[PDB]
Amino acid sequence: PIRRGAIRVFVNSAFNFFIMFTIFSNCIFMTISNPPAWSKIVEYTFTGIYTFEVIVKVLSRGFCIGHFTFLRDPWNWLDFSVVTMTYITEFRTFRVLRALKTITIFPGLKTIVRALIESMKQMGDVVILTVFSLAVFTLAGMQLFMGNLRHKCIRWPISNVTLDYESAYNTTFDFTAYIENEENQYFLDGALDALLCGNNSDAGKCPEGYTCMKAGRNPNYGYTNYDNFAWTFLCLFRLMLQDYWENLYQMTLRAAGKSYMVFFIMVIFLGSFYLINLILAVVAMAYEEQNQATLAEAQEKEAEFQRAVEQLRNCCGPWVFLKKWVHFVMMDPFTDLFITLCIILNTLFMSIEHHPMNESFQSLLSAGNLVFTTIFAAEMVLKIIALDPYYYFQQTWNIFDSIIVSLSLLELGLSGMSVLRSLRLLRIFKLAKSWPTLNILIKIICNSVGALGNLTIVLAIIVFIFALVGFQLFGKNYKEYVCKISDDCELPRWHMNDFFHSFLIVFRALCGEWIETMWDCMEVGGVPMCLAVYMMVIIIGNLVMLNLFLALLLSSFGKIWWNLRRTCYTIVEHDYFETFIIFMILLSSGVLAFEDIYIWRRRVIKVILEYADKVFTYVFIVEMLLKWVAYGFKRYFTDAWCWLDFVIVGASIMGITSSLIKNLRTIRALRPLRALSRFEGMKVVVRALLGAIPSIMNVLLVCLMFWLIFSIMGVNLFAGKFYRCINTTTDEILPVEEVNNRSDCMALMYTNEVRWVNLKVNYDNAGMGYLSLLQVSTFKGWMDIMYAAVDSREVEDQPIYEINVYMYLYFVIFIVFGAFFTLNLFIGVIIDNFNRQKQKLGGEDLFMTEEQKKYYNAMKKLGSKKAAKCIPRPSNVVQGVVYDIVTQPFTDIFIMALICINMVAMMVESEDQSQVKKDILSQINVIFVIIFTVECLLKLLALRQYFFTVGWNVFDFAVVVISIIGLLLSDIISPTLFRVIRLARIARVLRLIRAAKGIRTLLFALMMSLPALFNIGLLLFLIMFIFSIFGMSNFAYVKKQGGVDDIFNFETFGNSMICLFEITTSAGWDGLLLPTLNTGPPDCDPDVENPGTDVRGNCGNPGKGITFFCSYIILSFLVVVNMYIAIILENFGVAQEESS
Amino acid sequence: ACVEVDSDTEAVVGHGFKLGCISCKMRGEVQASATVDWWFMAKGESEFSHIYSYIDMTGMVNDERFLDRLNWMGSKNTFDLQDGSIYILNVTLNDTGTYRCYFDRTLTFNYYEFRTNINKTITLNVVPKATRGTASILSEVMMYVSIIGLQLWLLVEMVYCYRKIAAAGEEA
C-alpha cells in the first residue's frame, strides 16, 4: 500500500544522490556570514529535507516496532538525533551536527569511524596510567610553586617632606588595595602582564625602589596560576605536549628561582615519555586493524577461490619517415637523460632570484626561462607525434608534462600570479623513476589518495567539523567582547569572527599550539565551553593524525729500539695511565667553563686558567707522544677516534707557537669533545648514529630538493614585500593613511625620526627563504613570518594591516606537504634502517656496552619471577590474629582508600585559603601519617623477619619513615627548604602503584631500558656542553631582545645550560636567533662599552648566529629521535615475547 | 653584559694609575641620569675633599695636590655611567690614602623620576718598583712543580718498564 511505496523510494540511489547534495549544499552554507535574502527559509529548507529523509527511513520499516528495528544500527541512530534537535528549534551546535550526515551516507567511511572508535576502546588502559601520572606531578608542582606566578614588582612609596603620596606619615589603610594597582607596579614596554620577580638569591631581581611582593593579577589573563589544582595541572598538561612551554618555563625560573631547572627536566623528559606510551598503544592497536585485514581478506580470497573452484568442476612518405625521425630519437636514450639535464638546469636558473636585481639579472632571468619553454614545448610536441596522442596521455607523467606546458605558455600572456613559473619544478618528481628514495615520497603522497584515501577524508571532515563548531559558538562573541582581548578593540590575528580565520585556529590547534588561542578563547568565550572544545580538538584530532601518521608508515614497508716500542704500547694498556688521562680531560674542560664575563671580576681564577692550560696541554703532548711509539704512524692515523687527539692537541701546538690565531680559541673550546673516545657508553651511541647518518644523507637530499621548490616559489610571492615602514617610538608599523610607497616614506624621515626596516628572517633569497621555511616547520617564530607575509602588497608598497589573507594557504599547503609527509618519510627510513642493523649487523642489541647487557638481563629475571608463599603465621598469645591483620584482603583494598582520601586531601590545597581551611588540612595530615605508621608498625611485629622481604613493604617502610620527618621539620621552621620538605608528602601517593598492575607493567619498562637511556642523555649532555662554551665566547653581550631578556643569555655557563635545554626540544629557537642575526647600527652600539669587561660592541654576527642553531637543531633532532628508538624497540620488544 | 669588579690598589710610583669604580644598576635597562663625585681620606687626617666631579663634561676640582693631573676614563657619552674610573697621572708617594666614590643617579624610570646613591671605597697603596702580584708568581712556581713532578713518573715508569721486559726479553 502507501507504506510499500516508500520502500521503492528508500532504496534508490537517485534519491540518495539528493541526500548527497543536501549535505554538500548545507556544508557550504553553514560556513559564511548569514545572508538575509536566503533567510531562515533556508534554515527551514534543510530542516525538512532531513525530516523527509527520516520519514522515508521510518515509513519504510514498519510501525512502532518496525521503527525500533530501524534504530538497531547506530548510524540510523544519530540521524534521529540531528533531525530531532533541528526540529525542536522551531520553538546551537546541533545545526552543525547536520554535517555529521556526511559520514553517515558513505558506506566507505563507516569502516573508519568503526576503526577509530574501536582503537579508542583499547587505549583506555593507558589514560589512567597517565592522568594519575600527571596528577602526581601537579601535587609536586603545586607545593613547590603555590602562588609563585602571582609575584609582581611593586613600588615602595615615597618618604618625602611634602605630602605627595605621603606613606611615611600613613601607610596602614590602602595597602591591600595599593599593590593591586597596575600603575604603581612595573612592566617593561610591550607586555600585557607585569614583571614576574621572585626574591630568592639568584632569581631575577627588580629595579631599585621596587620590591617583590606576592599579590597581583596572574600571568596572561589568569589562566596560568599554579594556585589551585586545576590550572597548575593544565600547565602541567601543557608541558607534556610542548605547547608554548618555553614561556611557562621562563616565568617559573624568573618567579621561583634559577635552580628549578631540575623540575622542568623531570617534567619534560617524563612529559615526553608518556607521549610515546600513548603512541605505542596505537602501534599495538593499529597492527591489529591490519592483522585482520590480512586474516579474513585472504580468507575471503580463499572463500571466493574455494566456492569458485567447485562451480568450475615527398610528404606522405615523410608522414611516417619524418615521424620515424621523431620516433627514432625519442626511444633513443639521448633524448631521455637530455631532459633530466634541462630539468635540473631549469631549476637552478630559476632559483637565483636575489632581491634587488638590476637590469642585468632582470633581463637574464626573463630571457632565460623562455629558452626552457622552447625545450619543454619541443619535449611535448615531439612526444605527441611519437605514440598516438591518447597513448602518450595514458601515462600520467606524459599527462602531467602536458599540464605544465599549457600552464607554461600562460605566463607570456600575462606579461600576482607568477607562482605559475614554479610549476615547472614539479617535473623533478619525473626524475624520481631513476631515483631511489623520492620514489618512496611519491609513493607516500599518492598513498594519501589511493588505498588509504578513505582516511584522509575523515581527517579532512573532522578538521572541517570543528571549524564550524568554533564559528558558531564564538563568532558573535568576538564581535561583542572583543575589548577584553586587544587594546583598541580591533579583532586579533586569530579570531572566530569568520570561517576562514576559524579554520586556521583549528589548523593551528591541531599542530600543537592551542594555548595561545585558549587564553583568548576562554575569556571572550567562557571558561567551560571554550575548554570543552580545545581538549576535544586535541583528543579527537591527535588520534586521527596518529592513525594517518602510523598507517602511512606501515604501507611504506735495533734490538733496543724494538723493546722500546713494546714498552710504549704496554704503558698505554694500563688502567692507571688511561684513567689518569680521563681525569686530565675532565679537569681541563672544567676550568674551561670558567671562561666568560665574570672572569674579569675574580682575579686569581684568570691567573689559574692562564697557567693551568700549559700543563694540561703538556700532558696531552706526552699522550700524543706515547700514542705514537705505541701504535706507529700507520696504525695511529687510521684509527678514527685517534684522529681527534692529533687535531685538538695539534691546535695546541699552533697556539703555544704564536708567542714567537684568535681562530684557535675555537678549537680549544672544542676539546671536551674528546671524551667521546674515552668513555665506553658514548662510543656505542656514536657508532650507532654513524650508521644512521649515511641513510640520513639520502633522506636529507630529498627534503632539501623538495623544499627547494617551495623556497623558489616563496621568493616569487613574497620577496622584498616584507619591508615595513615602522615608527621608532612604539614600533608600530605606520598605518598607510600615509606611506604607501617607500619613496614617500623617505620624506617623513627628513623631517622626523621614523625608519624603513626590512624583516630579519624572510624570503629575500632562495637560501634566506630556506631558513624562514625551517621556522615554519618547527612551529617556532612562525607567527612573525606570516603577519608580514599576509599583509604584503607589492615590491615597494607599504603593507596595510590585513590585505591578502588568503596567503595563509602557502604555509598550510607547505606544512602538510613539507612537514608532515616529509617527516613521515624520515621516520619511515630510520625505523627500517634499525631493522637492518639490529638483525643483520647487530651482535646482540644496541646502546649497551658489555656489562650493561648483563645488568639488563639481571632486571629481566626480576620482573618475571619472584614469588614467596605464606610466611610467619607465628601463632602466639602475644601475636595471635595479627597474621590475619596483614594478610586478609579486607585490609589491602582499604589501604588503597587511605591514600585516595589523602590524595584528595592534598588536592584542595589552593592559595589564599585562610587558616581555618589550612588548620583542618594540618590536622588531617597528622592523622594520615599516624594511620600508616601504626599500620607499618603493625606489619613489622606480625612478620618479624619475613615481611621485610617484600620490596613493596620495604617501599612502604621507605615512605613512612620519610613522612615522620616531614612534621618534625615543620616544628623546626628558610622558605626554600620548607617547600621541598613538603615534596616528601607526595611519595605516599606513589604507594598506589602496586594496586594498579596496568600502570606497573609499562612503568617497569622504564627501569628495563634506563641504562640505555643514560647514555643517550650522556652524549646529549656532551653535545650541550660543546655548544655552551662555544656560545659564551661568541654570544655573550649581544643586544638583549626577545629570548635573551635578563636571564636566558649566554653570559656564563650558568645561564647557557638553561638556555640551551629550552632549545634541545626545539622551542624558542627563533627567540634566540634575532639578537645574533642583527648587525650594525641601528641596533649596534658597537664600540659600546659594557661596564666591566674588556670587549666593545654588542653586535651579533649573522654567520656565527645561523649555523649555531641550525646545526644544533639537526643535532637536536637526531639524538632525541635516536632516544625514541631505544624506548620503542623495548616496548614493542615486550609485545612479542608476551603474545608467544 | 655587565659585571662590577673591585679595582687594584697596589700602584707603582711615577706612573699613570687607574682606579675604576663600577656601580651597576640593579637592572641594566631603565634609563638613568648620573653624577660621579670622588672623595679622599689622606693619611694626613680623616677629612675628605672634592677631588673630582662629573656631569657630561669634565668636572674639574681645584685641589692642588691633585690638580692639573686627572683624566676621565669612565663611561663616555650617554651619561648613564655605571663605570666611573679616573686616571691618576704621575703618581707620587703623597697619594697614598683612601678613596670613596659617590655615584648619585636620578634613574628617571618613565613614570616617576627616583634617585639613589652608592658608595665604593678604595685604599690606594703606593709601592715603589712594581712586582707581579704574589699569585702570578705563586702559580708560576706551582706550574713547574707539577711539570717536573710528571717528567719523573714518565722516566720512572719507562725505566721501570724498560728493565722489566728486556728481562723477559731473554726468555723469548
Ligand SMILES: *[C@@H]1O[C@H](CO)[C@@H](O[C@@H]2O[C@H](CO)[C@@H](O[C@@H]3O[C@H](CO[C@@H]4O[C@H](CO)[C@@H](O)[C@H](O)[C@@H]4O)[C@@H](O)[C@H](O[C@@H]4O[C@H](CO)[C@@H](O)[C@H](O)[C@@H]4O)[C@@H]3O)[C@H](O)[C@H]2NC(C)=O)[C@H](O)[C@H]1NC(C)=O
Ligand atoms: C621577599 O618577598 C616577600 C614576599 O614574597 C616580601 O614580603 C613583603 O614585605 C613587605 C615589607 O617588608 C610587607 O609589607 C608589610 O606588610 C604588612 C601586611 O599587613 C597586612 O594587613 C592586612 C590588613 O587586613 C592583612 O589583611 C594582610 O594579610 C597583611 O597582614 C603591612 O601591613 C605592613 O605595614 C606595616 O606593618 C606593621 C606590622 O609590622 C604595622 O604595625 C604598621 O603600622 C604598618 O601597617 C607592611 O606594608 C609585605 O606584606 C610582605 N609580603 C607579604 C605577603 O607578607 C619581602 O619583603 C621580600 N624581601 C625583600 C628584601 O623585599
Ligand SMILES: *[C@@H]1O[C@H](CO)[C@@H](O[C@@H]2O[C@H](CO)[C@@H](O[C@@H]3O[C@H](CO)[C@@H](O)[C@H](O)[C@@H]3O)[C@H](O)[C@H]2NC(C)=O)[C@H](O)[C@H]1NC(C)=O
Ligand atoms: C610615532 O609615535 C610617537 C609616539 O606616539 C608620535 O609622537 C607624538 O607626536 C604627536 C604629534 O604628531 C604628539 O602629540 C602632541 O602632544 C602634545 C603633548 O605635549 C599635545 O599637547 C598635542 O596636542 C599633541 O597631541 C605626541 O606628544 C608625540 N608623542 C610623544 C611620546 O612624544 C609620532 O608622531 C609617531 N610618528 C609619526 C611619524 O607619526
Ligand SMILES: *[C@@H]1O[C@H](CO)[C@@H](O[C@@H]2O[C@H](CO)[C@@H](O[C@@H]3O[C@H](CO)[C@@H](O)[C@H](O)[C@@H]3O)[C@H](O)[C@H]2NC(C)=O)[C@H](O)[C@H]1NC(C)=O
Ligand atoms: C605612491 O607613488 C605614486 C606614484 O608613484 C603616487 O601617485 C601619485 O600621487 C600624487 C599625489 O598623491 C599625484 O600627484 C598629483 O596628481 C594630480 C592628478 O592630476 C595633479 O593634478 C597634481 O598636480 C599632483 O601631481 C600623482 O598624480 C600620482 N601619480 C600616480 C601615477 O598615481 C602615490 O600617491 C604614492 N603614494 C602615496 C601614499 O602618496
Ligand SMILES: *[C@@H]1O[C@H](CO)[C@@H](O[C@@H]2O[C@H](CO)[C@@H](O[C@@H]3O[C@H](CO)[C@@H](O)[C@H](O)[C@@H]3O)[C@H](O)[C@H]2NC(C)=O)[C@H](O)[C@H]1NC(C)=O
Ligand atoms: C707627567 O707624566 C707625563 C707622561 O705621563 C710626563 O710627560 C712629559 O711632559 C713634559 C712637560 O714639560 C715634557 O717636557 C717637554 O720637554 C721638551 C724638551 O725639553 C719641551 O720641548 C716641551 O715643551 C716640554 O717641556 C716631557 O718630554 C714629557 N715626557 C715625554 C716622554 O714625552 C711628565 O714627565 C709628567 N709630569 C711632570 C711634571 O713631570
Ligand SMILES: *[C@@H]1O[C@H](CO)[C@@H](O[C@@H]2O[C@H](CO)[C@@H](O)[C@H](O)[C@H]2NC(C)=O)[C@H](O)[C@H]1NC(C)=O
Ligand atoms: C709630599 O708632601 C710632603 C709634605 O710634607 C713633601 O715633603 C716636604 O717637601 C719640601 C719640599 O717642597 C721639603 O722642603 C720639606 O722638608 C718636606 N717635608 C719634611 C717634613 O721634610 C714632599 O716634598 C712631597 N712630595 C713631593 C714629591 O714633592
